[PDB]
Design a protein around this ligand. Sequence first.
Ligand SMILES: Nc1nc2c(ncn2[C@@H]2O[C@H](COP(=O)(O)OP(=O)(O)O)[C@@H](O)[C@H]2O)c(=O)[nH]1
Ligand SMILES: [Mg+2]
Length: 404
Amino acid sequence: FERTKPHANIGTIGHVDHGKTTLTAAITTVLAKAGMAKARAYADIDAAPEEKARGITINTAHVEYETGNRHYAHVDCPGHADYVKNMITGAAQMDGAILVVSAADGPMPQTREHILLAKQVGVPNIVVFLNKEDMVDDAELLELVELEVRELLSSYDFPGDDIPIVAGSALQALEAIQGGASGQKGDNPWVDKILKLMEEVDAYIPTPEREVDRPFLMAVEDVFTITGRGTVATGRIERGSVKVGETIEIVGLRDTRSTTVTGVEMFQKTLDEGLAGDNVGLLLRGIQKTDIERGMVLAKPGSITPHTKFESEVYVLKKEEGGRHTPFFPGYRPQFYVRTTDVTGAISDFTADDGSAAEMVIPGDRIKMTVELINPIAIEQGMRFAIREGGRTIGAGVVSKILQ
Ligand SMILES: Nc1nc2c(ncn2[C@@H]2O[C@H](COP(=O)(O)OP(=O)(O)O)[C@@H](O)[C@H]2O)c(=O)[nH]1
Ligand SMILES: [Mg+2]
């Protein structure tokens, strides 16, 4: 028996004015007829609030709803910049994305850019809604837009042959419900296309693995000497779990070493097991406090490795949001905040979206670049980091490819 329906995190991406917010409203309104959502008006979702987090401001609407199969958290954002920042900082988990493409316009530059970013930041799967079908009276033209979108997806290494594409009209489905449509399949053809979209989302976007089932990872935040037999390392477990008696690795800054966990402690609790989300103190056999420091991580052995050089997608903050007025440039050497500590690094090999070399990336823009750190640290694809100068965040990045 499953006590709770499965959960996924998704969002609407795509070019401005293609219909992302109207589709979000239509999904909540159609599912509200079944009792599975609070209906959210376009005007409400469109007026997305500001959210600030770790020095980065984004405008994001959040809606929740469920289908018969799965519960969803769904993000929608007003502007292209909001998507760039949300995807690079990972402010919303995206287990998949609904790409909205207007059938009247076809793919546009932010269609391409949002697919690029979805690939680079690791969004697993995409479903497409080909919106504004009411504006296109020729089935021939709709098939040509579908093929163009499949080719675009394939060019960013998504499986363009397998991605579900559902055509319809978010605006006509909302108007149909307003005019009395029941929300039952077969009652209205525009509502049926929203139901079909959510059937495809349910079937094609995988439910994420539970965090406690992934390989253990904990960033070390503080360290204590209490007995002569080991050091207590404290932090918040990011994923997985750790049990007394297990071998773990200490990764980053010094050569990788293994130790046995001989105790797990929380306030007023002596535990056999620490779980993802828990703030814990772990007793590490044989480790001296001098061997271990902030910036290191504890991990299931072999599950994460130390690295110094990687490709990343980087966003440069505008002065208005707390950054600097000056562009990032090759050989700039700022600080990289990697989970718990600054590491000096140098940036290089700026690569524009068309593959050509770039001279700089200006504030408010994003680009692919290479980072080389002065010291090795545990790095994996999808890891986020901040770029800092004097403790203020001036950029944000996500690891897209390990190089060394
Ligand atoms: N004809 C038509 N207009 C639509 C449709 N969906 C959205 N629109 C209109 O297109 C404009 C942009 O839609 P919006 O949802 O704000 O786009 P977003 O910028 O992608 O969030 C609005 O005026 C919508 O009413 C549709 O299916 N058909
Ligand atoms: Mg919108």
